[PDB]
Structure formats: C-alpha cells, structure tokens
Amino acid sequence: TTLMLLPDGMRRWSEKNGVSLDDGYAAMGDKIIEFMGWAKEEGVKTLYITASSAANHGRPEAAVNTFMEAFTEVIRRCHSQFKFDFSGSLDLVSEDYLTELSALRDKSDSESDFTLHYILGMSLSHEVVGIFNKLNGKIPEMTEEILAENAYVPTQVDYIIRTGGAIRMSSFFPLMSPYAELHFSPVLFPDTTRADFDAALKDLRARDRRFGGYPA
Amino acid sequence: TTLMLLPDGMRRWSEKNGVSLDDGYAAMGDKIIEFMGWAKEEGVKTLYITASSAANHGRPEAAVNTFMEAFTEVIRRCHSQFKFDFSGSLDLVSEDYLTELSALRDKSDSESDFTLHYILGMSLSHEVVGIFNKLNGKIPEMTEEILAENAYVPTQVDYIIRTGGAIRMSSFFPLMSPYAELHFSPVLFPDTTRADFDAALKDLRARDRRFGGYPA
Ligand SMILES: [Cl-]
Numbered sequence: 546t547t548l549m550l551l552p553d554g555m556r557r558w559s560e561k562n563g564v565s566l567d568d569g570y571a572a573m574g575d576k577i578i579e580f581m582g583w584a585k586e587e588g589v590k591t592l593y594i595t596a597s598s599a600a601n602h603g604r605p606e607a608a609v610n611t612f613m614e615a616f617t618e619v620i621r622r623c624h625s626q627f628k629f630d631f632s633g634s635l636d637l638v639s640e641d642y643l644t645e646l647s648a649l650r651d652k653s654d655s656e657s658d659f660t661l662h663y664i665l666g667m668s669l670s671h672e673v674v675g676i677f678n679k680l681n682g683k684i685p686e687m688t689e690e691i692l693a694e695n696a697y698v699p700t701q702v703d704y705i706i707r708t709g710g711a712i713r714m715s716s717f718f719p720l721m722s723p724y725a726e727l728h729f730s731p732v733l734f735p736d737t738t739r740a741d742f743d744a745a746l747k748d749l750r751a752r753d754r755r756f757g758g759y760p761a
Numbered sequence: 762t763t764l765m766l767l768p769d770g771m772r773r774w775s776e777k778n779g780v781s782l783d784d785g786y787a788a789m790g791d792k793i794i795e796f797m798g799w800a801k802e803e804g805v806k807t808l809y810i811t812a813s814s815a816a817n818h819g820r821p822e823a824a825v826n827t828f829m830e831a832f833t834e835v836i837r838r839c840h841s842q843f844k845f846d847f848s849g850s851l852d853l854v855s856e857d858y859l860t861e862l863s864a865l866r867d868k869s870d871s872e873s874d875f876t877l878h879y880i881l882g883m884s885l886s887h888e889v890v891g892i893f894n895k896l897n898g899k900i901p902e903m904t905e906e907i908l909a910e911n912a913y914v915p916t917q918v919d920y921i922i923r924t925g926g927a928i929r930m931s932s933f934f935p936l937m938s939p940y941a942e943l944h945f946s947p948v949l950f951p952d953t954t955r956a957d958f959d960a961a962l963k964d965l966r967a968r969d970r971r972f973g974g975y976p977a
C-alpha cells in the first residue's frame with residue numbers, strides 16, 4: 546500500500562494549547578514517528594508526507610527553518626529504519642537543507658522494504674511550470690510516461706489522509722494519482738491517536754477502488 | 762461564486778431503477794437543467810460541469826454517443842438561458858460534436874450573467890501533456906499566468922460538489938484551484954433534490970476559505 550499523509554494542524558494545535566510554534570512542530574515530529582510505526586504495522590510500504598507547499602517557502606526565513614528543522618529531525622532520528630527519499634520544488638529549498646537531506650538519503654537503508662518520502666514545495670502549478678521549463682524546446686513531445694518520470698510523486702498513491710479538518714486538497718493533489726482515495730480527519734495532526742488512524746484505514750480499505758488504465 | 766459539479770451516479774441509477782443507460786442519461790439531462798436553476802438562485806455565477814474524463818472517450822463509440830448526445834441535448838434545449846462555453850481534451854472529441862458545441866456557444870446568450878461551462882475529456886495528465894505539446898519550443902518559459910490561460914478550467918473554482926458517494930477526485934481535480942472546497946454527496950446524481958443541493962451549499966458556505974497568493 547502507498548499512503549500519502551497531509552499532516553495539517555500544527556499551528557492551530559500550538560495556538561489551541563498556548564505553546565510555541567517550535568513545540569507544535571516538535572509534537573508533529575514525534576507523531577510522525579509514531580504514525581510511521583502504525584503505517585508499517587498495517588502494511589503500508591510507501592509513506593509520502595507533504596512536508597511543505599511551494600507557498601510555505603515564501604514565509605519568513607525563521608519560520609521556514611522551524612518546519613524544515615522539525616521535518617529533518619525525524620529523518621536524523623530514524624533514517625536507519627527506512628529508505629528515505631525526497632522530491633518537489635527543490636529550487637525553493639536552502640542548499641544547507643538540501644545537502645543534509647541528500648546525506649540522510651545516502652545514510653538511510655536502501656534495502657528497507659519501507660520508503661519514507663518527503664514532498665517539499667508541493668503545488669501543481671509550480672510542479673508543471675518546473676517540468677515545462679526543464680524540458681521546453683528540449684524534447685519533441687510530452688507523453689504520460691515522460692510526465693510520470695518527472696512528476697514530484699514518482700509512484701501511484703492509493704490513499705490520502707488529510708488531518709486538521711480542511712476538506713480541500715490545497716497544494717497537495719498528486720498529479721498522476723487521480724484515483725487516490727481521500728480520507729479527511731478533523732483531528733489536528735499532533736492530537737492523532739492510533740484509533741483516529743485505525744478509523745481512517747478502516748474507511749479506506751473498504752472503499753470500492755478504481756484503477757486507471759492505458760492513456761488516451 | 763464559481764461551482765464545479767461532478768455529476769456521478771448515472772450508471773448506478775439506471776441499474777437501480779431497472780432502465781436503459783439512455784434513460785439514465787436523459788434523467789441526468791433533466792436534472793442538470795434543474796440544478797442550473799438552483800445554482801442561479803443561490804448566487805452561483807459560473808457552473809462548470811465535468812461532462813467526461815479523457816478515459817470516458819476510450820469507451821466504445823455507442824457509449825461515447827450516449828453521453829455526448831445527452832450533454833449536448835441540455836445545451837440544445839436551454840442555450841438561450843445562459844452563456845455557454847466548453848473546453849478540455851478537444852483532440853478526443855469527434856469533429857461533428859465540436860462543430861455543434863461551437864454553434865451552441867455562438868447561439869447562447871453572451872450577455873447572460875450565468876455561465877454553464879462543460880469540461881470534456883478531463884484528466885490532469887492529459888491536460889498537462891497537451892499544454893506542453895502546444896507550447897513546446899514556442900515560448901521562452903512557462904509562468905503561472907501562462908499555465909492559467911491554457912488550463913482546461915479557465916477561472917478559480919470556489920466549490921466542488923461530487924455526487925454519487927465516491928470520496929476521490931478521479932480525473933476531475935481543477936489544476937489552478939488548489940483551495941477549491943470539496944463537498945461529497947452520497948446521492949446518485951439523477952436523485953439529487955433541492956434539499957441535497959441546499960445542504961451542500963450550507964456546508965460549502967460556512968467553510969473557513971483560503972485563497973492563493975503570488976507564486977514563488
Ligand atoms: Cl490549507
């Protein structure tokens with residue numbers, strides 16, 4: 546199973562509890578590690594996590610480093626437990642975070658049958674723009690196969706969990722996975738319990754799935 | 762307000778009521794006309810309807826003509842009551858139907874405040890592929906503005922209503938509207954009542970909305 550987690554709710558959890566944004570993101574880091582264990586136990590093989598939108602990288606440098614440091618900490622803690630990978634709008638990410646993440650990809654277990662994959666600077670319009678400008682005037686035509694090899698999410702997504710209560714995709718729709726089953730939880734990400742996750746998976750596993758076929 | 766309608770449930774409604782798919786598609790036709798009235802009354806100004814996926818046009822000819830004929834009939838019957846437009850994977854649609862729709866756009870009321878706009882052969886991958894190949898080697902670079910002027914859905918979508926109970930986007934996510942608010946209705950589209958529509962709007966209208974800002 547391939548699962549994509551949209552872990553929304555950090556700021557509002559911090560505000561709710563009267564604690565700093567650094568605390569919220571620390572709680573998010575701990576919850577990601579717990580969630581990863583739950584996913585593993587339920588047979589998820591690939592866990593995509595939307596670390597950021599393209600819009601998030603236009604925030605103040607200080608606030609960018611808050612989330613970046615929190616997402617990187619998770620990988621510093623657990624890179625030996627999985628194959629780590631990342632992609633997205635890498636042009637938006639500071640060199641020092643790109644160097645660290647590359648090192649952590651290299652230090653992670655390429656023989657793990659579990660993949661943890663961060664999407665950074667996610668956004669369809671930014672994604673398409675980027676792919677266009679990389680290949681524009683360079684190749685003779687685009688095909689769905691060439692699109693898929695340049696897409697931020699390199700494989701098909703079976704399920705999406707969005708926490709935090711918004712019922713919208715925001716910047717995080719996977720370009721090449723039209724038939725991903727969507728589960729929206731009202732729980733703020735750092736409050737997610739194992740029962741919230743189990744309810745999500747019970748819903749998702751019972752859906753009448755649809756797979757796509759050959760392009761048009 | 763801009764509303765996109767994903768009117769799923771025709772095939773299952775016909776099966777449930779023991780009738781032909783032609784009868785399913787005519788009940789859908791009658792209901793689009795009714796829904797359009799309902800949307801006018803609640804302040805909808807542009808109503809996008811997802812008439813087909815790109816995948817829909819790989820079905821056999823007979824099956825294609827059933828849906829193309831039923832959607833085109835709505836517009837034959839009502840074109841004087843709104844401004845009509847259409848877009849999408851026009852490369853997949855037969856010349857006869859493009860000519861007729863093009864005539865119906867012309868004969869519709871271009872001075873109406875209400876737009877009914879059909880998306881044909883919707884699919885992000887096929888969309889992006891098409892936009893790429895149109896513009897490949899033709900411009901020095903893509904920007905968000907240029908993407909937006911070539912996208913199938915030409916304006917921002919505020920709300921999406923998907924009937925028929927699936928909780929997924931299928932081929933139908935609007936490329937340039939990350940923050941479109943999603944409402945999933947379990948009702949099969951030909952059974953949709955005013956009360957279903959009102960509850961959809963009561964939910965969509967109370968959402969905490971978010972808007973996009975300048976690209977990166
Ligand atoms: Cl959001």
Ligand SMILES: [Cl-]
Pocket residue numbers: 755927931
């Ligand atoms: Cl579907």
